[PDB]
């Protein structure tokens, strides 16, 4: 009942970078990711919700997939603006709380 | 020649049984389901494993000895295990992101039948040249003509597993002694409507009000309920069927043989 | 998967005769209409003859009505084309080709070489890193150690140079350098 | 003409019992049941379908038993169409609905039609476009003007040939067919799912509002029927109809007539 996502990722501009996340039946399984995207010295934004849906703001070239207990997020496009801490957060049913990742800080 | 009905203290008597679904069963763990269905290479080479192929189902039920006969009255029937069908969580493959699982649906086959002997029946094929799998009884000497009709291939529904759906159907020409009813619904979308209820008889009386006669004291259940296709989350599809409960009303009947 | 074989062809002389064999691995021939279809050297391509699964019903081009006739063989897979009458137009490397419903015709073979002249089989003679062949007839021609086109000369005959095993089947020349 | 009693008696009521096929185009040895591959016209001018795309009825002339004054009285009709369940062969090179998809089934525009006559079912011409050239070796309306687009009363015929008059340019006429009983069904569009009950348990009566049936001039009863089921989609997409044969059995009694 922990989500595990890589403590970083890189990529070349252009490319698709994906970060993954992890978890268990008790979290990932039964509800859903949101994905938060954070620059030094600012608070957290959401970038995904439900898995899978941008809020409006977000480009088309942020993405996700989920298949059962395990979630990825895909950056295509690669831009420097990107440089950041990727955070992944879900509830879990049976510890009755909000569990996140460790964070991935995605260099360019 | 069927003389008059017998009354009095036991002149009547009730089979109540249900059928099984016979779908293909791919492995230990998959009974009511077909093999994930596949197509073949070119319309010529056509050729379904068996495990692909759903059957009729035929039951012979043994009746009280008794010249006597048993007539088949009136029919109470329904599908078994109708809610099943709402299982849309089971690695199904999601409609649409955070869809649930799209539910069974699909090209469907609901039939029933009531015989005092085996349901009489002919071939026909979508395909003469589709090579119907070792080990089911399908049409011989299968010609152009077998597409539309050809009177060599009559059979009867005498074995279980046997008779695969899609190359069988009650011989109307025939069937005397059998009360039979059943409905193709096709297309990949037709949504399950499946009614139950323990208040609807159905009369097996004909238009002189005669039932069928149980030949050798057995009444012949036959039953087919291809409920619909079960998509999987690569999205291959496995026929799904039900059981089919039967309650038949007999009473004994005259008759000079 | 599916092949398709073809054999039969060679050298032969106007008002002649010759027949074609195509040998079908790899699926129920016996289930499927089976074509002849021929390429004139340097032209496109020319639909021949089609034969029913049954052989019920055949059809031929104009260009050869009454002079060839197909014929199969279901228990041998083998689909064949008898030539009469052949005339020099009927220079072709000709193809054997499946038609199967809806996707139409699919499958070819690698073709057989049918070449039609009055002129005789003259075999090659052999010989910078490499050797040549001179004034051969017809074009079929193998180079092997354990290669250019070859030009059509006024005199009729072909000439070849590579860069040995040297074969010429036609010619049954099989000489080592 | 005039209608008398119906005769009772040792010899008063016979059976017809036969099945009817379906005239679909049947392209080729190999595709009887089918029409072949659909094609459309360059232009709403140049309308021209080959008679292998095009289904039509099918009829049935059967003698019955000679009389003499008495005729044939059709009285009841069961009918069902023959081999529904072939419709679930979704293996044989169908079109995938979507990757590991079973094939597509036969689906869509469907014409369920039946007539019980003593005498041949009685056309009406009607035309979806008037210029459409009906191909050689079928019998279709003649002197097609834009009028026989809606209504022209010069395209009358008669049920009288199978493999004849394609299903698209021909209905019961009406105005007529006084002495036959008939019965059909257009549902249209490409996604029409199939919905086909057979049962030996369901009677048709042939008597209209004076409890006369269908009277058999000649001593012949006259079966006419279509039923186009739907479209059979192949791998490429190319659409082919597909036809199912009708089973037929009709009651007969005898009935004196002027």
């Keep these: 009942s922990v989500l595990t996502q890589p403590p970083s990722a890189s990529g070349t501009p252009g490319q698709r970078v994906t970060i993954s996340c992890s978890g268990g039946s008790s979290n990932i399984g039964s509800n859903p990711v949101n994905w938060f995207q954070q620059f030094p010295g600012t608070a957290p934004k959401l970038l995904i919700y439900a898995n899978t849906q941008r809020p409006s703001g977000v480009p088309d070239r942020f993405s996700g997939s989920k298949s059962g207990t395990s979630v990825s997020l895909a950056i295509s496009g690669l831009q420097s603006e990107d440089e950041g801490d990727y955070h992944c957060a879900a509830w879990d049913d049976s510890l009755k709380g909000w569990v996140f990742g460790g964070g991935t800080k995605l260099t360019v | 020649e069927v003389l008059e009905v017998k009354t009095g203290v036991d002149s009547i008597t009730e089979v109540e049984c249900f059928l099984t679904p016979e779908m293909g069963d791919p492995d230990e763990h998959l009974r009511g389901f077909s093999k994930s269905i596949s197509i073949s290479d070119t319309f010529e080479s056509d050729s379904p494993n068996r495990d692909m192929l759903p059957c009729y189902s035929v039951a012979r039920i043994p009746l009280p000895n008794l010249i006597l006969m048993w007539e088949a009255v009136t029919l109470k029937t329904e599908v078994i295990g109708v809610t099943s069908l709402m ?138 309920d291809v409920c619909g296709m079960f998509t999987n989350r690569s999205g291959s599809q496995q026929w799904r069927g039900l059981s089919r409960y039967f309650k038949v009303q007999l009473r004994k009947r005259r008759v000079k043989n | 998967e599916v092949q398709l074989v073809e054999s039969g062809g060679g050298l032969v002389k106007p008002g002649g005769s010759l027949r074609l064999s195509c040998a079908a691995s790899g699926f129920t021939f016996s289930s499927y209409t089976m074509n002849w279809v021929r390429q004139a050297p340097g032209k496109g391509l020319q639909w021949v003859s089609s034969i029913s699964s049954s052989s019920t019903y055949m059809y031929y081009g104009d260009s050869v009505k009454g002079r060839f006739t197909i014929s199969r063989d279901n228990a041998r897979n083998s689909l064949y084309l008898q030539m009469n009458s052949l005339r020099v137009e009927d220079t072709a490397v000709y193809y054997c080709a499946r038609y199967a419903h809806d996707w139409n015709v699919d499958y070819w073979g690698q073709g057989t070489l049918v070449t039609v002249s009055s002129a005789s089989t003259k075999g090659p003679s052999v010989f910078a890193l490499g050797c040549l062949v001179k004034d051969y007839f017809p074009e079929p021609v193998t180079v092997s150690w354990n290669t250019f086109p070859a030009v059509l000369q006024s005199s009729g005959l072909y000439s070849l140079s590579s860069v040995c095993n040297v074969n010429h089947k036609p010619s049954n020349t099989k000489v080592d350098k």
């Design chain 2, 87 to 224: 299982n849309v969580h089971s690695n199904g493959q999601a409609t649409h992101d955070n869809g649930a699982g799209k539910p069974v649906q699909g090209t469907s086959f609901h039939f029933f039948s009531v015989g005092g002997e085996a349901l009489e029946l002919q071939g026909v094929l979508f395909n003469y040249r589709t090579k119907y799998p070792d080990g089911t009884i399908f049409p011989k000497n299968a010609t152009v003509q077998s597409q539309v009709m050809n009177t060599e291939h009559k059979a009867y529904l005498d074995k279980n597993k046997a008779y695969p759906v899609e190359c069988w159907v009650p011989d109307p020409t025939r069937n005397e002694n059998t009360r039979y009813f059943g409905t193709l619904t096709g297309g990949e979308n037709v949504p399950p409507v499946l009614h139950i209820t323990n208040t609807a008889t159905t009369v097996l009386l004909d238009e002189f009000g005669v039932g069928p006669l149980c030949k050798g004291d057995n009444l012949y259940l036959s039953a087919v």
